[model samples]
Target: AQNPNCNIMIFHPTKEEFNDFDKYIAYMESQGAHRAGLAKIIPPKEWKARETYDNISEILIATPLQQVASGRAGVFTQYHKKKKAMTVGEYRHLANSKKYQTPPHQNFEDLERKYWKNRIYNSPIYGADISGSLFDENTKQWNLGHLGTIQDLLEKECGVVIEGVNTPYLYFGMWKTTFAWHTEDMDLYSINYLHLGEPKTWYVVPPEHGQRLERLARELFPGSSRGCGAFLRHKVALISPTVLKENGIPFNRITQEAGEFMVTFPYGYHAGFNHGFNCAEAINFATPRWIDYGKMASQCSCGEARVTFSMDAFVRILQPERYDLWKRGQD
Candidate 1:
């Protein structure tokens, strides 16, 4: 059971084969999107020309409440070493802060320029939520033949549509922008498609051992310094899977390239750092198997509970025919 490779799945589809969308979907289903710890699907060569962040700046530059990373160092270092969360703010402030010529010791601008040049990684700027045309099996299918984007389907099945807020959360990162370790809300499936840019190095811990990893975090970090209402307070913690492996916990690693789809199943704890400046689009989805889990995910402390899709509303919209089809699938 601890074969290591058993926890993470990878698939490569050529342009000709990926054009048959159903083939991709079938492969995902067989790998168990609802159960697999982590899965990676790399699209064919034709899709490699997808838009990069610079190319799509007009589309992304105007998003609101965009989380911009400020300060320095990885979140774990902030948590473990310096003892604080290096959270971000609005784009303007984040951008203007970069203009500072010098600090007490060094030229801040010079340091920033060198950081980018070296691809040393930094906090990411938020990208827009362009969630349209994405859908699942329970909704009216888009006419994209077999290769449709994967967002609207989750909204259709879950019945919680927030228009701009409900779609993919894009990340615009320079080198070293890190997403700290955490699982998807209530153990939901998260599929991240690299629209364009550099690769991301990911570390993942299987669903079954996520809590063990969390317990270790609490032990190492101790005390809740941020008080109540803080995400990743001392009480709420995250740890790299590398740390987990050191403790005898099984983990897996991968580098997600451009046009690749990386899926993390319910309760699969994952984290990664962008290799360099890049843009990524990520969204969450639910299958019938997630119905019960969806309810529980709503109670999770990841702040995801605040925006979870309503499984109840989805059931209300369920047509009799759809229910029958789902039942038959179980049989």
Candidate 2:
């Protein structure tokens, strides 16, 4: 199913159609103050999204721990038996507290272990308590907060439902993304909206193009790397009603005012890009299922220092008919 999708119909709404900003605010207030953190989503609407081609900052990558310190990454990354939001005074107290301690990291292996340790347990990744992401139905509704506001508005005003979770965790670092050429573990339905400002380019490389890239990765990295497509089955969807045999996914778009469109990605290969001042605030609702703890451990274990690194490599890669074996379970 991995293929590029080139046919896309987009709708940009006018200030009047999308002009109901107050209604959006009302929805959040109804949700209550505990959810005020949700307001952070307002920025995506007013502020333009920017794209980066900078070096993947290890510090930024390492900052999940910092976020944990700041009480943002969610609980799995922290070991405290009780988790709660800290007051400004509390944070200040800790900043000045001699009792505050920075946990140790010994080496690359240790750092990876710590990173995986927290990620595998966090709500966004595995949601340790319920399995899958927090939005998987089985888990608590993704607190959406501010992010949910815009997402709900997009669907109501533009008729596009945000796909995936309100709060998402991408395995790859920020400034870099797996979109445009990556497929979810399941067939997905949703649209990524560019809300803020600045324009970025997006492309849907053909499935064959992706396949060729995979082969190249295998050849160049030997056993050291896996192509993006190795684990994801992707497909392209052009917003033409006829594209879907008859009626394409229903959609609407208005330039300048704001843009939105609704469509079902045929569960295949496609990718999106946001470059320059590209800021996109999107709501994602995805197929529901429990988070796969096995996959979590498997990816983390791929690191040589992981306790099961060699074992996972042998089982996941060295198995008989590896490709055939993995393909059976894919949608």
Candidate 3:
């Protein structure tokens, strides 16, 4: 049975409800909103997320790669990438200076390999990890260190500091740049906040369809799928909605604008591209339910990145006051 309509759940929370991260998220999930793969959050008008790029004077330069449809269909676009470095300002100019030009790539394959053998076509900078974007998820205010859901449990895993997962990571994006279909590490939930700039169009497949989408991708790209147990984690191939429908997969999409947040559920397969220049801060967090999916996450076959923390150990540390006296004795 196919549910072809692209209906996504959008939340418009009040300033108080939005600020209470723990309560708000718990209630949102309580309403079965997580089943939608990703829920869009539009905060009250008064809230302003912290922007740290301006305070830092050093120009960050990284030749972030660009990807465009090789053919009419938006299937495989992982061709050549450029090595030339680009300053953050330079990339921002390319996106904001003019009317967004469609990447002039008619039969991009040959043009890329032959005469137009350059990496400048529809040049867009992709995700670049930026530092000094400290903010508290609970109050949505600037803090020395990010404080939110992870503070309760993730910190219990002692020792080592996980920059992006445990804390927060900010990424800059431009038009047509994508984060290919993939699941979060350890099958944890991920929340992304678009602090400012342009919109981002997201393509989400429900957690239930996670394996089906993976199977479809594996069948479509046999080369890339081989040897990798979690093939899609490579973040390579980006498929379109039309192709997904053709393959009998229903997908929901949403346009996330500035001053909004998009939270992805565990085991949900998602991919999307930025509408234009924008900045977002994201970090992975987990609910107790993640224990089930974390168990099923990646076992690694040389291709997938292994889980950084021990879930079983982390859970035991939580001391799930779960078992009653008889149950505890039985165990």
Candidate 4:
């Protein structure tokens, strides 16, 4: 049977509509698109962007394409594989060379494994610091540090930068590469744009069905979930939408073409892979609207200190109440 599809309302904004990012997003949320976990935006026709990939340096290695943890892969991690730090020009060369597209060795699995293991796919820069790279040159209107009403208000309202959380990261994709299912840090809002290259396929579960989605993940990877209730944060697992729909959870697919944007809502679980080779950038930003949702988020049950955004600082500073005040009710 085919996978079920939930509608993800798409917006093709006029220049005037696109210019007012907050107003446009606010309207979309009010119209109930966030229920789908994410929404897609196609910018006005004249929003042309150009980036010089050759000048990018020390591009981080993103994948030995972590195939659906259930599927087999070429070379995942060779024992003797030394450090491989890829660059943008290096990755572009690899992407277009057709050298990495070798057939699976049905006759000899070992040979196929040997061949693919050596093929380096600089899949994603993996949200690493892109500040020094070719980032804000022309793409800051929404990438990361831009003049958006909510995030700007949020910074002033809280007096904290949350630098990394508010900044943009780069991703370089190759065929079969997967971004595991997860929500934004602190359940904050996020946006991803394909500056250019192949289309990306995104799978999302609506906020209402978010639990059902989590239930499915925990069921599939019981051990991981057992160790940490927030296991998805590990970013090392995946499930096909086929399995998701078969299991009765709702999901939506967003095909993000070059020059288009996709926005994810707080607590919206999303994951997907690139069609082939694609270049995209993404960032997470929050509004006052995120206070409750942000505070309501959980730290991984691993008992480890994996701090992202320290939210209570604002609450503690603004209201000055805490364990001290809570103890008042202890009697």
Candidate 5:
């Protein structure tokens, strides 16, 4: 029995329920993007994005140490309070350091919490058009893979062409690999498909109650910028569902299993950890209703924050062109 404070809805769609993909699309749309949903169904073969990582184990070993030693590859630890862009060489060294690894018979209460070693290799967040990969070239149909017709329709008809929004990236997680509490850029929607491996446990807070949770976080971690409540924080804060309920903030928990689809609606603060070793794929996408909110979020985020998005560059500036395209299409 999942708790209600988590605010995540579980949708167990029978084969018949999912038989007409359009019906499911309508159902998700009706639920709106602010409500997080878990859709259980057999993922199609092409949706098996994990197969791409099959040989990566040996590949990582073969990679030049100098390349990943520094740069965007992050080497994060507790004291730094932020991800340190180090070379892959240094990343490997720090990641494999004896200090970060657990010893045999350590008598650790929980192996998952014994050590925190996280390595993330995310795809380019800009201008990634992966619809082609998710769809069959000849038939031009979604492999019954990915989210389906609605996502495609949103991208095609709505002119919601934001880079990195539709492009999917691969995730490789080790034990204790964590993603800290945060919301998506511009309060947009995101979907994560656990292609293979152990489950990822996620904690989600609803969009409407995001500010209340922010206040709680501010109080808990005194001295964090009140102006940028959830944005300026550096370290991972593990806020449990019980704590959220105690404070009247709605949240939910969802353990994403292999082949399951986990969807987070706009502005939902979510954090998660990998069970052990696992691989997954995720991508961000948007609806027309999200444009104003994206601009608002972009404006609210501070310059020094870990804000990778530029709503002005991606959404606002393109309004005229997008409008023209819409008009032409209508004509």
Candidate 6:
């Protein structure tokens, strides 16, 4: 499968994301962040509107990629592998053929052509219900088709483009690994922030450092290690309030750091370590386009023009074990 040619460039605030509630709402409006939906909307204090808006500024690691009762890597591995055989076109066709169904709002056809198409591997497994899951152009509850409309507005008003895809708002109902940490699948840049009861520690590896880390992840951690050909693993650290220690050999350049946020440059090899925190992550990348991997880095190995990316590694040693047993079924 080709890696999503997306890039997540992060920015860390030297201070807290919101000084207080009023400031948070004001800042979100200033950034043009809209309420996720009627369901996930942050309720305002006195506003008559039942829903509230938030800045696309924070990413709740505990919320989006948290290991639910089902299991983190397991869910994604099964999700991707099961659907590994299809492409965007095939997926769209599956929808048309009635193999799956979508929400009334999602113009899945448009997204298939605009986002998924020729460059990546597709899956035929996941139900069509996902096709219309939570794509948006304006409010989360409504489907405005091209996310570019919102992206354009944000870039113009906020000065930053939101990259990645429609995962965050859509997955609000359940907590699962939204992405397998390889590379961004498109041309967009991601802005990952931290909040809440848990935190996510992301290891930013430059192309030069991928081999060693990938080997460690594959051999030691197995499923979590993804091969990022040219990108080196430059920076690594805990994003929440917790601190983790890795006995593995340290990189030659920078040492580890600690905090709620990390700023990753374009094409950086970054992976997150999960903990507990209430946070929000926003994707910051360009829009009205697709990503071209060739322009970013040349292939040295894995002759495949596309890339392989993963967010979880196989680590039985670190397993929460039967944490799924504690989960509310159907998650």
Top candidate when judged by lDDT against the true structure:
3
For residues 1-331, write the lDDT of model 5, one tens digit per residue.
2323334555656555655544654575565524543323444444333334333342132121111111211222221122323332343344345643223433332433333222333111111112323223342222223443323444565556444323555564534556656777556666776655666788777666777777777765564445444442343354544456777766766678777777766677887666544556576665555555554552233333343333333434435444343233223
Q: Which segments of candidate 6 are over 4 A away from where they belong?
A: 1-180, 186-188, 211-261, 277-279, 284-294, 297-331
Error of 3 at 204 (Å): 0.3
**Model 6 accuracy (lDDT, Cα):** 0.28
Question: Whose TM-score is greatest here?
Answer: 3
Tens-place lDDT digits, model 4, residues 84-186 = 5666666666655564332344433343233234333433322222432234456634434464533455667666553322456677776544577888765
lDDT of each model, Cα atoms only?
0.49, 0.28, 0.63, 0.60, 0.48, 0.28
Per-residue lDDT of 1-331 in model 6, one digit per residue for the tens?
Answer: 1112222222222124322322433343233221110001222222221133243223221211212122221122313222233333343343344323321334433322221121122222321112221222432221212323324433464465544234332112111122333434221334333322232334344433444444544443333334433222211111111111243422211111212323233344444332211223344233222123213432223222222221111111112242232121112
Off by over 4 Å in 4: 1-6, 51-83, 97-99, 102-140, 147-165, 301-331
lDDT of 1 by residue, 88-168 (tens): 233324433543211222443343335334322333343334343222333222122123322345455565452322345
**Deviation in angstroms for 309 in model 3?**
8.4
RMSD for all candidates, in order, please: 10.2, 17.8, 8.7, 7.7, 9.1, 18.6
Estimated TM-score per prediction? 0.59, 0.30, 0.74, 0.73, 0.60, 0.31
- lDDT for each residue of candidate 2 in 1-331, tens digit (9 for 90 to 100): 1111323333233433334434433333344311111112222232222233232222112222122221221111122133343332343333333333223567433433343334322221000111111122331212222233323533454464544234433221111111323333322223343333322233332222334434432443343345332422222111111221232222221121123222223232343322112223333332211112112221212222222112222234224344343433331
lDDT of 2 at 248: 23
- For candidate 2, what is the lDDT? 0.28
* Pick by TM-score: 1 or 5, better one: 5
Ranking the candidates on TM-score from highest down gives 3, 4, 5, 1, 6, 2
The whole-model C-alpha lDDT of candidate 5 against the native structure comes to: 0.48
Q: Give the true-structure RMSD of model 3.
A: 8.7
How high is the lDDT of residue 330 in model 3? 23
Candidate 2 TM-score versus the reference: 0.30
Pitting candidate 3 against candidate 6, the one with the higher lDDT is 3
